[PDB]
Curated annotation (Swiss-Prot):
Enterobacteriaceae carrying this gene (identified by PCR) have been isolated in Sweden, India, Pakistan, Bangladesh, England, Scotland, Northern Ireland, Australia and the USA. The organisms they were identified in were K.pneumoniae, Enterobacter cloacae, E.coli, Proteus spp, Citrobacter freundii, Morganella morganii, Providencia spp and Klebsille oxytoca. In India most isolates were from community-acquired infections rather than hospital-acquired infections, indicating the gene is widespread in the environment. Its EC number is 3.5.2.6. The keyword Zinc applies. This is Metallo-beta-lactamase type 2.
Length: 229
């Protein structure tokens, strides 16, 4: 927890830009961090990823109400793991519209997760079909291909130098990819590089389990992935 960070309950918030904050929640497994984003877009707020749990995700919503005081219009979640979708019910209880890759929603029940209300689909070039992501404002959603998981998606924030790699991208000092059973080790490297190419001017790379990094996180991640093919 660095200087300039705010704490609300068990959550930590770091402002990254005038209209963007990183939310961080922890699960004791020894407190393992997971990062998401909060975006102020005019008179509304957009959320990328829940916290680990419903209660933690409610803390995010209370912090937003208290510190930003704008309604949360929608949330997009970036794949079907507990750190990204664990608080879906808290969002739904607040009347927030939720979006995920169709595959994430298909996987959610098997994972003991609650599926989002709406499914995103993607063109062959990886960009989201705009009709499935209505009124996403500055959020530009890109499916880079299979990597960390088959369903992982990524998000750039228009008007900023920020892109969110989710759990696909590791920080540039990482000693391993942590890749498990559901990783695609054949395509991981190409998918990391695809994320980089989709958001070629993003200079701040936000990710799920490390603090924000430079684009070196992308190239370092791709190098680690090259070794697995
Ligand atoms: O693989 C990881 O590094 C992170 C932290 S521990 C492991 C279990 S939950 C979450 C899924 S991305 N995760
Ligand atoms: Zn994951
Ligand atoms: Zn994760």
């Amino acid at each position: 927890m660095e200087t300039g960070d705010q704490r609300f309950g068990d959550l930590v918030f770091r402002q990254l830009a005038p209209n963007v904050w990183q939310h961080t929640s922890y699960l004791d497994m020894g407190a393992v961090a997971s990062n998401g984003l909060i975006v102020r877009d005019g008179g509304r707020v957009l959320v990328v990823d829940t916290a680990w749990t419903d209660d933690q995700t409610a803390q995010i919503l209370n912090w937003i109400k208290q510190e930003i005081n704008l309604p949360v219009a929608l949330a997009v979640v970036t794949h079907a793991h507990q750190d990204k979708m664990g608080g879906m019910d808290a969002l739904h209880a607040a009347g927030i519209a939720t979006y995920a890759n169709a595959l994430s929603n298909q996987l959610a029940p098997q994972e003991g997760m609650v599926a989002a209300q709406h499914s995103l689909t993607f063109a062959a070039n990886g960009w989201v079909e705009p009709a499935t992501a209505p009124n996403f404002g500055p959020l530009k959603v890109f499916y880079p291909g299979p990597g960390h998981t088959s369903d992982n998606i990524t998000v750039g924030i228009d008007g900023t130098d920020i892109a969110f790699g989710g759990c696909l991208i590791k920080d540039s000092k990482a000693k391993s990819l942590g890749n498990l059973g559901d990783a695609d080790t054949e395509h991981y490297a190409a998918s990391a590089r695809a994320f980089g190419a989709a958001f070629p001017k993003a200079s701040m790379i936000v990710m799920s389990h490390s603090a924000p990094d430079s684009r070196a996180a992308i190239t370092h991640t791709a190098r680690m992935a090259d070794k697995l093919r």
